[PDB]
Write a protein that binds this ligand. Structure first.
Ligand SMILES: CCNC(=O)Nc1cc(C)on1
Length: 282
């Protein structure tokens, strides 16, 4: 079926939970043996969210190459994304090592450091220009260059220096700051505006490594971001845009990381975002 009328049909019939459970039943199951090794317990935020072995990002290190991060490679859309958990106190150096080694231009953050009164990720970037951060375990230096605070999101320019080689690179930090503590946004307008700002920066384009996107676990809000982006790109590429099937795209993405889209409300919000977005593109 088309999307917008499939949407109203699920609303009128109140069957979002059944649609979402079907997706959960059909989703791929691949091994995640490296994630579960005892030496990696303090590298995982949640025991039930792990990268598959076949798609995990490897650190370029011989001691321990493990990070909780997955490469999502969308062949028809010609887009790739790295989805990862919010960094932990003992993985902030690994996080920036990955950014460096994978040649990423942008980092997309969809959570606040504290939500619901608890810490959802480490404070992994510097908040003042004159107070830079040094990651001694991976030999990197990170400096805040500029910060632009808007009503729904903040954009930061950062400099990452590899202290071994003295090479430097400019990284863009796109921080969506207004996702509510509970539920999903009432309108997709600010989330779509944010997606378009990431696109306009070059951070999603083939001349760079894959964008790094995270929330707390790296599957819920993060899944919503890449699902909406890929569906809108396919609608521009194909002769028949109404052939784009959001459930099929989601199942393809779940071949590369488990659990993408965590609730039936997140599924409905993803439909809404693609529907509204497709009208603005034209
Ligand atoms: C339908 C032909 N035009 C476009 O698709 N325009 C755009 C704008 C953005 C953004 O994506 N497509």
């Amino acid at each position: 079926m088309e999307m917008e009328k499939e949407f109203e049909q699920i609303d009128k019939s109140g069957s979002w939970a059944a649609i979402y459970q079907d997706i959960r039943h059909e989703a791929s199951d691949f091994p995640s043996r490296v994630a579960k090794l005892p030496k990696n317990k303090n590298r995982n935020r949640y025991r039930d969210v792990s990268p598959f072995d076949h798609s995990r990002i490897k650190l370029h290190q011989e001691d321990n190459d493990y990070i909780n991060a997955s490469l999502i490679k969308m062949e028809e859309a010609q887009r790739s994304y790295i989805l990862t958990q919010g960094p932990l106190p003992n993985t902030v150096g690994h996080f920036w090592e990955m950014v460096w080694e994978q040649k990423s231009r942008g980092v997309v953050m969809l959570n606040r450091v504290m939500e619901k009164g608890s810490l959802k990720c480490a404070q992994y970037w510097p908040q003042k220009e004159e107070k830079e951060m040094i990651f001694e375990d991976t030999n990197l230096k990170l400096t805040l260059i500029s910060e632009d605070i808007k009503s729904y999101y903040t954009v930061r320019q950062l400099e990452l220096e590899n202290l071994t080689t003295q090479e430097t690179r400019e990284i863009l930090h796109f921080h969506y700051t207004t996702w509510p503590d509970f539920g999903v946004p009432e309108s997709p307008a600010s989330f779509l505006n944010f997606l378009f700002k990431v696109r306009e920066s070059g951070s999603l384009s083939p001349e760079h490594g894959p964008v790094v996107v995270h929330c707390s676990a790296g599957i819920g809000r993060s899944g919503t971001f890449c699902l909406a982006d890929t569906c809108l790109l396919l609608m521009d590429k194909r002769k028949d845009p109404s052939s784009v099937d959001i459930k099929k795209v989601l199942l393809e993405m779940r071949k590369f990381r488990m659990g993408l889209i965590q609730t039936a409300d997140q599924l409905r919000f993803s439909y809404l975002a693609v529907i509204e977005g497709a009208k603005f593109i034209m």
